[PDB]
Design a protein around this ligand. Sequence first.
Ligand code: MN9
Ligand code: MN9
Ligand code: MN
Ligand code: MN
Lengths: 348, 348
Amino acid sequence: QNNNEFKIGNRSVGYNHEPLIICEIGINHEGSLKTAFEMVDAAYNAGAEVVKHQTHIVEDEMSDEAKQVIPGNADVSIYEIMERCALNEEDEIKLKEYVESKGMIFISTPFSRAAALRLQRMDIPAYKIGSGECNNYPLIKLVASFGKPIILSTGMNSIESIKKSVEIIREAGVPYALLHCTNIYPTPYEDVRLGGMNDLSEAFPDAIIGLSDHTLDNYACLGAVALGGSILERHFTDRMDRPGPDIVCSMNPDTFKELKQGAHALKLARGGKKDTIIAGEKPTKDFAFASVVADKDIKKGELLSGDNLWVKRPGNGDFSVNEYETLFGKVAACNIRKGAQIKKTDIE
Amino acid sequence: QNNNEFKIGNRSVGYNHEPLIICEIGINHEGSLKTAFEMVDAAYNAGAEVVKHQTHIVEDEMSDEAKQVIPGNADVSIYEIMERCALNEEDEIKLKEYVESKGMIFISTPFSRAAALRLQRMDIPAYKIGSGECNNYPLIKLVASFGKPIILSTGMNSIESIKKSVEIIREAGVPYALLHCTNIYPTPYEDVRLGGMNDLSEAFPDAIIGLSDHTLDNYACLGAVALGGSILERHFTDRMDRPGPDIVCSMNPDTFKELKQGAHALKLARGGKKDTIIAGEKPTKDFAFASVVADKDIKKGELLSGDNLWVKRPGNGDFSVNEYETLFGKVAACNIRKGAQIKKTDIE
Ligand SMILES: CC(=O)N[C@H](C=O)[C@@H](O)[C@H](O)[C@H](O)CO
Ligand SMILES: CC(=O)N[C@H](C=O)[C@@H](O)[C@H](O)[C@H](O)CO
Ligand SMILES: [Mn+2]
Ligand SMILES: [Mn+2]
């Protein structure tokens, strides 16, 4: 499919690498640092490599009007949701320390210029841009200027729209990933359109391609690995009985383990060429291919024909079924017994 | 991807249809009709639509040489294995009756001319050609002459080799499916090469494409549905404690149910276009897109610039973040308050 790669710290990312699962705890901690640590713990214990946060600073990321608009998966204002779940800088720093104290990579999504500038002071290894901010070219310009790689969610945007963000990233010269995404919480299967992944890499050949997902299970993310995705992102929780607008479409430690397992299998099985010769198939070839046999007794000097020849397993005959017809017209040099393979010495 | 379809009895098969799972009991019944019925039962009870058999007639399908060649997943001759598992015509007829008495479609794989002629007397709705016989053009010629659709496994064969079989099928004018396949029992993930599916449909645009599989689990078959497969075939057993050379890579009633479930989900999620507009995304668009706001107080008659403008959620502003730069140079008609959206009445 392709050979693009870049590193997030020490982790190589790309088609020829192990697909990377981003556990976004996001606002699932409900603004509690203690809950965020329990979620980071569940992710460590499940084998996660990367915890992603959301860096919310309510005054810089929304104007007064956001206190009157309700998101689709909640019933209060988006302003109220972020004032309730936002971690301040002192605690977000503690989150990053904790995540790395558990051996894992911390990245986050900035929603504002102030949030973007806070993460650069923390010196995170790479930056996630969410689907809302995929058309936020002034913000993309700022993050790309930090010189880290950029993982850009691409939901709710067209190729034409994304191309303007991608020109900005290329200009800064940082490597980048494009994540196909659908921003309904949760997302019906029929709205995933995994074909959108091929569309994205056909439109931008230099990009790592993966999927951000908000369906109820793993099927979409597994399908994306089969298609060549290198990065899979689901929301993450320690347990499903947590409160919060994104908990519903999150994975828990067990389903992460399923996803990590399917991702590994499909990383091996995907791709390749039809025509490749698999050495392990040879004993099956040798016994199951057909060889040309006599279909009846054939007298010395009689002509071989489609009436006195046929084909039978196994494959060690002098003439393969591929050469069946080239024996027509040839003359019997011996008496040939019915059911015997046609040997070269059976014809003049 | 494509729009090809044909029917197996009453079941429509193709990309725009529900993917079809073939439960091949094969030689798992170990030659026992009573065991074959227990396997047909487990398949009915699990929700199967199609039971596939293998139609073995040891004298017509192999010569004397097959009593000296051992298949890779066993330790006796292929001749011995088939003499032990082969159902005679009286019992194979009873199998087909039973399978249809349970509401299901019976198809089988012929391995010989006699086997092919037995199935036409039974008047099966479609024919499976296994990977061993994919280069058996004289046998393919005979089966295609029966006028039923043909599902052709394509393991251990190149595109160039398959093309000769496909010319034969097209000539008879029956619709056909191509199944990508790897004939190692069982098959490591790394040998599946799911890309071979795209290769097959790129080489033959009129064919239904699916996968025949012999890996240990469902990951491959799920990946094939994500890629657009319409037909999935695994070996089938009622329980895993059965004896036999193919039991190992078979599915049981539970894992079939998993596969049928993943197949249904990935049938919905696969395909589509990136640029499609998902109506359900609109509330997220309205709250998460940014609008141009004043970044500082701006005096009446001052010029708007990248220093006094910025962008903030939500999306109901007069100017989208897409129009951010077109506001540069415009003149303030009012006093504009810091943090307020730029309204059209704020500029001359
Ligand atoms: C558009 C957007 O930013 N969506 C976020 C996911 O990345 C969500 O986590 C929202 O913050 C959340 O669903 C609001 O209820
Ligand atoms: C090449 C071939 O015919 N393989 C069959 C599957 O379709 C197997 O079921 C074999 O009959 C079996 O594995 C022999 O041990
Ligand atoms: Mn998300
Ligand atoms: Mn098989």
